[PDB]
Design an enzyme around this catalytic site. Structure first.
Site, PDB file in Angstrom:
ATOM      1  N   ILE A  10       0.752  -1.180   0.070  1.00  0.00           N
ATOM      2  CA  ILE A  10      -0.035   0.049   0.054  1.00  0.00           C
ATOM      3  C   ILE A  10       1.055   1.339  -0.124  1.00  0.00           C
ATOM      4  O   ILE A  10       0.350   2.384   0.275  1.00  0.00           O
ATOM      5  CB  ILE A  10      -0.871  -0.087   1.232  1.00  0.00           C
ATOM      6  CG1 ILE A  10      -0.257  -0.072   2.485  1.00  0.00           C
ATOM      7  CG2 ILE A  10      -1.728  -1.178   1.042  1.00  0.00           C
ATOM      8  CD1 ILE A  10      -0.979   0.468   3.802  1.00  0.00           C
ATOM      9  N   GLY A  70       8.614   3.966  -0.586  1.00  0.00           N
ATOM     10  CA  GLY A  70       9.399   5.262  -0.254  1.00  0.00           C
ATOM     11  C   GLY A  70      10.706   4.802  -0.198  1.00  0.00           C
ATOM     12  O   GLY A  70      11.321   3.633  -0.673  1.00  0.00           O
ATOM     13  N   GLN A  95       8.988   0.011   2.537  1.00  0.00           N
ATOM     14  CA  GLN A  95       7.758  -0.368   2.105  1.00  0.00           C
ATOM     15  C   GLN A  95       6.974  -0.316   3.054  1.00  0.00           C
ATOM     16  O   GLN A  95       7.036  -0.499   4.516  1.00  0.00           O
ATOM     17  CB  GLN A  95       7.664  -1.864   1.607  1.00  0.00           C
ATOM     18  CG  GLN A  95       8.534  -2.158   0.239  1.00  0.00           C
ATOM     19  CD  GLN A  95       8.506  -3.561   0.061  1.00  0.00           C
ATOM     20  OE1 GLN A  95       7.829  -3.847  -1.176  1.00  0.00           O
ATOM     21  NE2 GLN A  95       9.143  -4.146   0.768  1.00  0.00           N
ATOM     22  N   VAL A  96       5.432   0.081   2.893  1.00  0.00           N
ATOM     23  CA  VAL A  96       4.310   0.017   4.025  1.00  0.00           C
ATOM     24  C   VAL A  96       3.533  -1.119   3.667  1.00  0.00           C
ATOM     25  O   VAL A  96       3.208  -1.106   2.153  1.00  0.00           O
ATOM     26  CB  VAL A  96       3.701   1.502   4.048  1.00  0.00           C
ATOM     27  CG1 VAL A  96       2.460   1.294   5.191  1.00  0.00           C
ATOM     28  CG2 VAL A  96       4.733   2.547   4.395  1.00  0.00           C
ATOM     29  N   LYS A 108       5.156  -0.552   8.321  1.00  0.00           N
ATOM     30  CA  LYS A 108       6.508  -0.063   7.468  1.00  0.00           C
ATOM     31  C   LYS A 108       7.610  -0.871   7.702  1.00  0.00           C
ATOM     32  O   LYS A 108       8.358  -1.025   8.734  1.00  0.00           O
ATOM     33  CB  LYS A 108       6.618   1.441   8.112  1.00  0.00           C
ATOM     34  CG  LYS A 108       7.688   2.445   7.461  1.00  0.00           C
ATOM     35  CD  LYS A 108       7.022   3.804   7.724  1.00  0.00           C
ATOM     36  CE  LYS A 108       8.503   4.596   7.596  1.00  0.00           C
ATOM     37  NZ  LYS A 108       8.021   6.099   7.614  1.00  0.00           N
ATOM     38  N   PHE A 158       1.648   0.297  12.595  1.00  0.00           N
ATOM     39  CA  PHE A 158       0.796   1.804  12.795  1.00  0.00           C
ATOM     40  C   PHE A 158      -0.545   1.302  12.588  1.00  0.00           C
ATOM     41  O   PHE A 158      -1.093  -0.121  12.162  1.00  0.00           O
ATOM     42  CB  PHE A 158       1.355   3.025  11.838  1.00  0.00           C
ATOM     43  CG  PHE A 158       2.367   3.304  11.975  1.00  0.00           C
ATOM     44  CD1 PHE A 158       2.755   4.353  12.649  1.00  0.00           C
ATOM     45  CD2 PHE A 158       3.523   2.884  11.100  1.00  0.00           C
ATOM     46  CE1 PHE A 158       4.104   4.891  12.912  1.00  0.00           C
ATOM     47  CE2 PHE A 158       4.782   3.402  11.241  1.00  0.00           C
ATOM     48  CZ  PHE A 158       4.977   4.527  12.225  1.00  0.00           C
ATOM     49  N   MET A 196      -4.207   1.511  10.661  1.00  0.00           N
ATOM     50  CA  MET A 196      -4.710   1.563   9.296  1.00  0.00           C
ATOM     51  C   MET A 196      -5.536   2.661   9.230  1.00  0.00           C
ATOM     52  O   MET A 196      -6.928   2.500   9.507  1.00  0.00           O
ATOM     53  CB  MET A 196      -5.243   0.446   8.816  1.00  0.00           C
ATOM     54  CG  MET A 196      -5.559   0.369   7.277  1.00  0.00           C
ATOM     55  SD  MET A 196      -4.010   0.386   6.349  1.00  0.00           S
ATOM     56  CE  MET A 196      -4.704   0.773   4.719  1.00  0.00           C
ATOM     57  N   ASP A 240       7.031  18.253   7.314  1.00  0.00           N
ATOM     58  CA  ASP A 240       6.329  17.973   6.151  1.00  0.00           C
ATOM     59  C   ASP A 240       4.972  17.946   6.281  1.00  0.00           C
ATOM     60  O   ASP A 240       4.334  17.082   5.913  1.00  0.00           O
ATOM     61  CB  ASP A 240       6.951  16.472   5.579  1.00  0.00           C
ATOM     62  CG  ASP A 240       6.806  16.307   4.166  1.00  0.00           C
ATOM     63  OD1 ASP A 240       6.566  17.096   3.347  1.00  0.00           O
ATOM     64  OD2 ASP A 240       6.534  14.950   3.895  1.00  0.00           O
TER      65      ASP A 240
END
Ligand SMILES: c1ccc(CNc2nc(Nc3cc(C4CC4)n[nH]3)c3sccc3n2)cc1
Length: 343
Positions: free
Chosen positions: A31, A34, A38-39, A54, A104, A106, A153
């Site tokens: 999903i 970066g 990956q996530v 992550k 984390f 969702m 950011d």
């Protein structure tokens, strides 16, 4: 073969949909992708909940950088405790087949998704007021001396919504974040949301986040990014259109002053003749907001909470968040005492 066949040529975990990690996480799909790695969306069988994991790249560099993130995520966890400050918190972290794995909550929508659900005409000043109080609460939390965290950011892409707990948002991605004093940089923040101090190569502190919040609040209620520069010069021209020439006490101390302005013979600052631009300070916020014309393109004319007095309160807040001077830009505490929030 890399990492016994579990990694690609590029230090990343080879994600297979359906894999059970440690009889706890059922992976559903990639999903996210970066520089960090990956996530993934996964079902946590023990907590009976969907989580985003992550997977950090299997490489010393990225692991110690992610371990900086884990410090802040956990310091942010020592404080708070009851998960009530609009931050996407780290539930936990583990090592699995030589990848650092951050778990984390969702959430499947960001602030962007909500502005495509409005065909980019934006949302009630009532909803804007709610999110603004959430965001300001989050920046107040980040400003707790023990924390003193700069997100670096803030942008619609990094603002996630709790559909379940409708009319609630949370800030995400502390991978670009740093703590006050950590050491000044030079090219941080998303361009559209980039503070004048950073554009000018000056030192920065928690105020750059309040600047970015000013630009997001306008973009929530108009549907449109306030300052969409295509490069740094256009971005600083777009700012000046609205707020005028930055003061002298700022430009006289700005390394990149002359990338945008020129000191006249009398000592007074001005712009540089190279897309032409409104003269300084003439794209007024009073007008963009539609303060006296029922909101942007007078769409919320009449609607409760959209009176002139409501918009005089909102404009005053934005303009205090868009102060050029980071010494006197509104701090989150006084921002929460503002009349725009009050009964
Ligand atoms: C790759 C993937 C995600 C991110 C954070 N951005 C993000 N995260 C989402 N979901 C997500 C991330 C998290 C935490 C993993 C950070 N929980 N839920 C969603 S849902 C729609 C847009 C969007 N953008 C950053 C890099």
């Amino acid at each position: 073969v890399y990492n016994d066949g579990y990694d690609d040529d590029n230090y990343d975990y080879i994600v297979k949909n359906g894999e059970k990690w440690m009889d706890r996480y059922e992976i559903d799909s990639l999903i996210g992708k970066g520089s960090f790695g990956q996530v993934v969306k996964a079902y946590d069988r023990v907590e009976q909940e969907w989580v985003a994991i992550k997977i950090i790249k299997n490489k010393k560099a990225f692991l110690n950088q992610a371990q900086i993130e884990v410090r802040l995520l956990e310091l942010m966890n020592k404080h708070d405790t009851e998960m009530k400050y609009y931050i996407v918190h780290l539930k936990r972290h583990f090592m699995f087949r030589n990848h650092l794995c951050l778990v984390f909550e969702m959430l499947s929508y960001n602030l962007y998704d909500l502005l495509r659900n409005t065909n980019f005409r934006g949302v009630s000043l009532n909803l804007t007021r709610k999110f603004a109080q959430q965001m300001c609460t989050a920046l107040l939390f980040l400003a707790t001396p023990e924390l003193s965290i700069i997100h670096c950011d803030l942008k619609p892409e990094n603002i996630l919504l709790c559909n379940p707990k409708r009319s609630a948002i949370k800030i995400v991605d502390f991978g670009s974040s740093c703590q006050l004093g950590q050491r000044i940089y030079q090219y941080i923040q998303s361009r559209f949301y980039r503070s004048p101090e950073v554009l000018l190569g000056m030192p920065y502190d928690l105020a750059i986040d309040m600047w970015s919040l000013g630009c997001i609040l306008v973009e929530m209620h108009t549907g449109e990014p306030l300052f969409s520069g295509a490069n740094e010069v256009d971005q600083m021209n777009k700012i000046v259109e609205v707020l005028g020439i930055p003061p002298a006490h700022i430009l006289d101390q700005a390394p990149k002053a002359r990338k945008f302005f020129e000191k006249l013979p009398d000592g007074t600052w001005n712009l540089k003749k190279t897309r032409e631009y409104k003269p300084p300070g003439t794209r007024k916020l009073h007008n963009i907001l539609g303060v006296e014309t029922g909101g942007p393109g007078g769409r919320r004319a009449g609607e409760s909470g959209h009176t002139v007095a409501d918009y005089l309160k909102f404009k005053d807040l934005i303009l205090r968040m868009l102060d050029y001077d980071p010494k006197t830009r509104i701090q989150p505490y006084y921002a929460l005492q503002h009349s725009f929030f009050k009964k």
